[PDB]
Amino acid sequence: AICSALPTIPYHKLADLRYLSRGASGTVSSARHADWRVQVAVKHLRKDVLREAEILHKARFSYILPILGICNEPEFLGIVTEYMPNGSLNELLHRKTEYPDVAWPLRFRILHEIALGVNYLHNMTPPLLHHDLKTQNILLDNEFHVKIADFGLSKWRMGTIIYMPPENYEPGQSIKHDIYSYAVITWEVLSRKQPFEDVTNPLQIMYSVSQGHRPVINEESLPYDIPHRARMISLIESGWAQNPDERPSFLKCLIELEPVLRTFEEITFLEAVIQLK
Amino acid sequence: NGEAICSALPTIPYHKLADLRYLSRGASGTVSSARHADWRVQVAVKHLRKDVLREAEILHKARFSYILPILGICNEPEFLGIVTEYMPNGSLNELLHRKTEYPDVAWPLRFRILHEIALGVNYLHNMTPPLLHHDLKTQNILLDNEFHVKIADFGLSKWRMSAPEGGTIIYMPPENYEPSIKHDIYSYAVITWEVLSRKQPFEDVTNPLQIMYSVSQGHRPVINEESLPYDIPHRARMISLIESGWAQNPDERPSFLKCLIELEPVLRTFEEITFLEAVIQLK
Ligand SMILES: Cc1ccc(O)cc1Nc1ccnc2ccc(S(C)(=O)=O)cc12
Numbered sequence A: 001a002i003c004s005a006l007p008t009i010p011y012h013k014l015a016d017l018r019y020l021s022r023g024a025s026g027t028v029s030s031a032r033h034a035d036w037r038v039q040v041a042v043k044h045l046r047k048d049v050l051r052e053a054e055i056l057h058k059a060r061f062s063y064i065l066p067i068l069g070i071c072n073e074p075e076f077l078g079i080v081t082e083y084m085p086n087g088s089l090n091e092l093l094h095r096k097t098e099y100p101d102v103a104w105p106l107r108f109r110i111l112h113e114i115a116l117g118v119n120y121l122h123n124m125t126p127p128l129l130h131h132d133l134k135t136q137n138i139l140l141d142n143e144f145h146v147k148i149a150d151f152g153l154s155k156w157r158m159g160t161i162i163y164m165p166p167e168n169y170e171p172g173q174s175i176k177h178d179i180y181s182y183a184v185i186t187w188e189v190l191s192r193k194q195p196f197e198d199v200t201n202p203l204q205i206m207y208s209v210s211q212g213h214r215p216v217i218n219e220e221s222l223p224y225d226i227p228h229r230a231r232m233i234s235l236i237e238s239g240w241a242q243n244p245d246e247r248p249s250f251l252k253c254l255i256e257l258e259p260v261l262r263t264f265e266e267i268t269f270l271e272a273v274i275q276l277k
Numbered sequence B: 001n002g003e004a005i006c007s008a009l010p011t012i013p014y015h016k017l018a019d020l021r022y023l024s025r026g027a028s029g030t031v032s033s034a035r036h037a038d039w040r041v042q043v044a045v046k047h048l049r050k051d052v053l054r055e056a057e058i059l060h061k062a063r064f065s066y067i068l069p070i071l072g073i074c075n076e077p078e079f080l081g082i083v084t085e086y087m088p089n090g091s092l093n094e095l096l097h098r099k100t101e102y103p104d105v106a107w108p109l110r111f112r113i114l115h116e117i118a119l120g121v122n123y124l125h126n127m128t129p130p131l132l133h134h135d136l137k138t139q140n141i142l143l144d145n146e147f148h149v150k151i152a153d154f155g156l157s158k159w160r161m162s163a164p165e166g167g168t169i170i171y172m173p174p175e176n177y178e179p180s181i182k183h184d185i186y187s188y189a190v191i192t193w194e195v196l197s198r199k200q201p202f203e204d205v206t207n208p209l210q211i212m213y214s215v216s217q218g219h220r221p222v223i224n225e226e227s228l229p230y231d232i233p234h235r236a237r238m239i240s241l242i243e244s245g246w247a248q249n250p251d252e253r254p255s256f257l258k259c260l261i262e263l264e265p266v267l268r269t270f271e272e273i274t275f276l277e278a279v280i281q282l283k
């Protein structure tokens, strides 16, 4: 019955508070800890801030954003985590002048790590379903390893709608949500395009998706030089299938990815990363 | 501890560990690599009780960026073990002395390693109550896939709240030889000397008891040109740090916090790209 408690952090211990972004679930700032001498990130606004913190603390694993502690004062309320210096997967894929080249090995490693993380969540007792996966929520650490974030909408099994399966928003309203999101993410990673960019109104997307339309798969979106192209397209297509029952579990998904990741020499990952610097 | 939020360490059935491969055998037990059948990640497992379980409780409570991360325990009539993330690059000890396999070990990496160990030990000392490692050595500093530091082996560690404490002779302060908050810093100093020189401390002496005598008198590892070449970045501020940390007097030894404060500017003199370059050089 081994237990660990989340440390409590005094606000006066957070020096150099600098703004990073404003979001639906609060504001994120970077800082340094006065005693530990490390950079941290702080997300400040209540029941919600307390909830995400408990989830990160219970869901700790190699591919989940690691929580360092909580700031629980009458004057200030925040979640403290390690700092992710390389932003989000969304920025890596779409800031093409800042990152003209993103080598395949790193793209596949990112996909593998996201699957590993969600798999772990689904394998907790009770299972945790993220339900808000998107490229903006996949953070990248100092070495470009994945840390899944934003547990605000996650549910214990007991904005943008491009990553949401049709059954969630059909009129008169799931354990197959995360895999749907993963399929859209995979498509996005392998093409560096925004899904449905050509569609100005989100309701037209929602309507198209409910009718079975999905991001386009052809040579312009997914070029023929993509390593293991057939295997990935096939994984993407089953992942976003109309019928949730036909979507694979993350175990199946990982068993498919494994042989692909074995083809890359370990040094090519390091070379892909230094090319970004 | 705040709000009373708690996290439990998962139990892992032994049969969920596939592909067991022997890695090593030491004092505290046998260490093997494996892959978790459900989680699909490589893991390391240390097997042979209240001792094994004690390390698991410490690792689980002392979770931090530079502390070996624990994933769960095996608690079965058949088997008892500690399951952690696997460290693909072994120990700092192997990096420093396996000169054929690692012909060159760039300075920025060395300094990053020194900084991370200090950050790790500093965090431990700042816990409430504080934790003291008592067995810091190069064999207990593990290196991950990108050569970042994970401090391991909390077997001889103690919370701060009569025979001498345990440890490895060469990294042990002299006042702990017979029947203290300044044990770790002494070990750190010997570690620092070892990192900058790539030499065995007290290499000349074949008899470990002679070492204990010498150290008691006042000798320390050799600080000259032969051991610490002149081309060492900040050789002076470093040699200063080594000597104050391994003082004969426990009270003339600095806290980890003060060491950090000195090391930060030194680390800021290295460009980010030089760390990645050092790592690619090792592969
Ligand atoms: C703090 C926090 C808590 C909980 C949670 O779900 C997310 C965060 N956010 C972050 C955590 C660590 N590093 C980050 C780095 C950058 C950004 S960004 C994209 O610029 O907003 C956010 C970060």
Ligand SMILES: Cc1ccc(O)cc1Nc1ccnc2ccc(S(C)(=O)=O)cc12
Pocket: B023, B024, B031, B044, B045, B046, B068, B082, B083, B084, B085, B086, B087, B088, B090, B091, B142, B152, B153, B154
């Ligand atoms: C499992 C464990 C538990 C508790 C603890 O204090 C240490 C370990 N060991 C290890 C953990 C993760 N990676 C390792 C990689 C290599 C080795 S070695 C040097 O070959 O013995 C040991 C490792």
